[PDB]
Design an enzyme around this catalytic site. Sequence first.
Site, PDB file in Angstrom:
ATOM      1  N   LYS A 197       0.829  -1.197   0.000  1.00  0.00           N
ATOM      2  CA  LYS A 197       0.000   0.000   0.000  1.00  0.00           C
ATOM      3  C   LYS A 197       0.869   1.255   0.000  1.00  0.00           C
ATOM      4  O   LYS A 197       1.913   1.306   0.657  1.00  0.00           O
ATOM      5  CB  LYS A 197      -0.920  -0.028   1.222  1.00  0.00           C
ATOM      6  CG  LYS A 197      -1.917   1.099   1.333  1.00  0.00           C
ATOM      7  CD  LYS A 197      -2.817   0.857   2.534  1.00  0.00           C
ATOM      8  CE  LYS A 197      -3.739   2.027   2.817  1.00  0.00           C
ATOM      9  NZ  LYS A 197      -4.682   1.713   3.927  1.00  0.00           N
ATOM     10  N   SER A 229     -10.333  -0.558   6.374  1.00  0.00           N
ATOM     11  CA  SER A 229      -9.513  -0.293   5.195  1.00  0.00           C
ATOM     12  C   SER A 229      -8.685  -1.492   4.737  1.00  0.00           C
ATOM     13  O   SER A 229      -7.950  -1.395   3.749  1.00  0.00           O
ATOM     14  CB  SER A 229      -8.598   0.902   5.467  1.00  0.00           C
ATOM     15  OG  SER A 229      -9.354   2.075   5.715  1.00  0.00           O
ATOM     16  N   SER A 249      -9.186   1.775   2.442  1.00  0.00           N
ATOM     17  CA  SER A 249      -8.225   2.612   1.732  1.00  0.00           C
ATOM     18  C   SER A 249      -7.162   1.804   0.991  1.00  0.00           C
ATOM     19  O   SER A 249      -6.402   2.352   0.199  1.00  0.00           O
ATOM     20  CB  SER A 249      -7.540   3.574   2.705  1.00  0.00           C
ATOM     21  OG  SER A 249      -6.879   2.875   3.744  1.00  0.00           O
TER      22      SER A 249
END
Lengths: 440, 438
Positions: free
Chosen positions: B75, B174, B150
């Site tokens: 990420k 997320s 996210s």
Amino acid sequence: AMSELSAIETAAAIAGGSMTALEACDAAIARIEQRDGPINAVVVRDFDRARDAAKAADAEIAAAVRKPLLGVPMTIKESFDIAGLPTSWGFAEHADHIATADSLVVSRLKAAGAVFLGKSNIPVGLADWQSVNPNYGRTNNPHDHSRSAGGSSGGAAAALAAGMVPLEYGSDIGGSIRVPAHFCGVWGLKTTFDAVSLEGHYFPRTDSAKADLSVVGPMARTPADLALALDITSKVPLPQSRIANLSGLRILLLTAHPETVADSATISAVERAAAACEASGATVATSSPDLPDLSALVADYTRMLLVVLARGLAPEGTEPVSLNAWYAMLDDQARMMRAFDRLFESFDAIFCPVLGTTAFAHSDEPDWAKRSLSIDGGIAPFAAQLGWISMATYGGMPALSMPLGADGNGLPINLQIITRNWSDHDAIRIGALVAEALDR
Amino acid sequence: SELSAIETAAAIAGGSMTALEACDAAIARIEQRDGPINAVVVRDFDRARDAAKAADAEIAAAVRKPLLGVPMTIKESFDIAGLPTSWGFAEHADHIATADSLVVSRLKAAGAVFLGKSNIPVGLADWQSVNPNYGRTNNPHDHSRSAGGSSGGAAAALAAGMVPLEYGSDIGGSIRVPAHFCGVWGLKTTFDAVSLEGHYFPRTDSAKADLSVVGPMARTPADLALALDITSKVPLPQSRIANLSGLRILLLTAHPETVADSATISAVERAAAACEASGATVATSSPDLPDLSALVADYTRMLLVVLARGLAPEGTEPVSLNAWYAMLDDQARMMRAFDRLFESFDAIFCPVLGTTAFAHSDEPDWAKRSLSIDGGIAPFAAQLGWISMATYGGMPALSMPLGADGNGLPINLQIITRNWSDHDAIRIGALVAEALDR
């Protein structure tokens, strides 16, 4: 000369048949009633219910049940909750506060078979390097009744040094485990932060446990009893040590601090432990470019300690610290924690004093700012000695307080062994290896 | 089908392929499939080939590491030295990290090769992945629906088969929501079990010290367990669960403050029923289940404070440090309430979210958003209650593939276990997969 069974030795004698759990309980009850007169350490006593738990442990022993501490009698620091027993932290207002449930550490140790005979004395609010309160009185050092037993886990360290119980458990937010073990010449492990649960170590009449700086850890007289108690009480099984000897060990020796001082006998005792390791194959350094600013650490640790102890409240008129500013202080703490992560890339342990001098004489001055200490005949500030314990508490690292020797007046001097975070078992192992090296 | 992370490392150590071959094969899959998806938004292919050539040199020296030569992405919020960390902000697009994050250090030390970083929303504050620096990530199952957030780019890269391993963060689902939307495996870990060092807000060294957790994402439960063992602060307790027989499961298909699809309700109920046929006991209620309506309220008030760093709008009074300390005591009280619940149950089976991947939304305000639940309109922000228990209680929560709705969008199951039983959440999840494939 005069020796008592350790916690592991007691469990081995009960599982073998040398003695029963009730015999070990009654033998400790005898040692308490015989020796706690001039010491005043086991201030809360639950002997009747303890004998009933020992009789139940012998039933499990007879049912072939075997647990690591089955039948081992012990006490715990009074700040820990035990159902049916009071938890006062020394406050007179909280002397009738009886806990309804056992603390997590007590549950873990009871689940391993331990029998709790009572609870050990503490200062008011766990806020002193002494053990004195209006509910129970003052605890006296078993090596010299005129000197302090330490604090806040002083009653725990005094009971251990007098041979009453082989195992204990205390708390530490400003040396409250290392200093008592230092003053009484016993073994105390300040554990890694957030490694053991503080559930039950509640402020009286609340369910609030400290979420910053404070740690709970085992106290005993043998490193093996510390290691067993750590494995019984930690949230998860912690990494076991793979250190087999002192050869190749990287030690950072520190006998001075930018904000406090140490005795000459203290400096020579810590220097003697480092030398015993060099002859056993270790390498010892006296300086490092990666040692964090200890003068800034103690300043940032004191500012956080006072806020944690005040629960964010401020004196009348004075503006409190804001939540945004608190979040900034935690980022400052994590910045220091990583500075030690880099230091512990070149060193396996830090050897330094637990405190600058031995057990001091009993003080009735509640204010640490109105106190002073005698360092080799000179007058030194009392509160400045917080810098010796600031690194482990503010960085979160485990720190072992182990017996090193005694000064010229017979007062014990202990060594602080600081290892990297989550290496609590290495701190115990290096400490046991220092003891072997010093006994050769 | 593509190779898993463990399979890739086994093929490199055996000689089926080299680390440079596995690196170049993943680079090919990214350039071939990420066109309409836009997941691998930060690319470091040149330096990745140099690290794969170094892994093959270690492989030739008989050196063996659990992920040696395995190509992967992480990420974008995680730091990689030489690569930018922006969290989607245009103001932070030129912020290049000088050092790797802790998770990246751990995985590199296990031999992993990082090809790049996966897309995120602005400020990691949405169940979508869209930002002015990189663009929008699209669900590989339906390019018109959100890939999640996210960590949406991570789940989309996994679902499209580009890389076998990923790692994300979770403060409000997320990790679980993106894996739910893309039908992949995601583990929300126990709080404070994995370090967030390097998961810094751009141009700071500040990582969230409350609620937020980082955890592995993959396509197999076994890859999740290896990455957890590589990145956790200490080796976490391994699972001893061998089958579903005797397992105590609390099935929850409803929430006092939100709703779930009927296809979602039947999917979680189908996973619970498959465990009963495998010997498990499933309950639909417990007198020891905490007040979920109070949990989500106390969690939301804390989430907003953590995300605001204690600051308040002009005129509004800030939360005091004393009141914050009381909120932490309120959190710990709920954590112990779950300690009692998990004395009668081994796991909670409940939806990750109330519906499948929603269509791309341009409304920044969650209060002006809604979701389609079986033809009806339901509030968007109320769905935070499905993920509130694990984040606010700290428990590990696994998002694992269950099936798909009538439109082909993946439906995942949330498996919540007790604190520090992350390996049990992975093990129960792997056992749920076996039961459903019979």
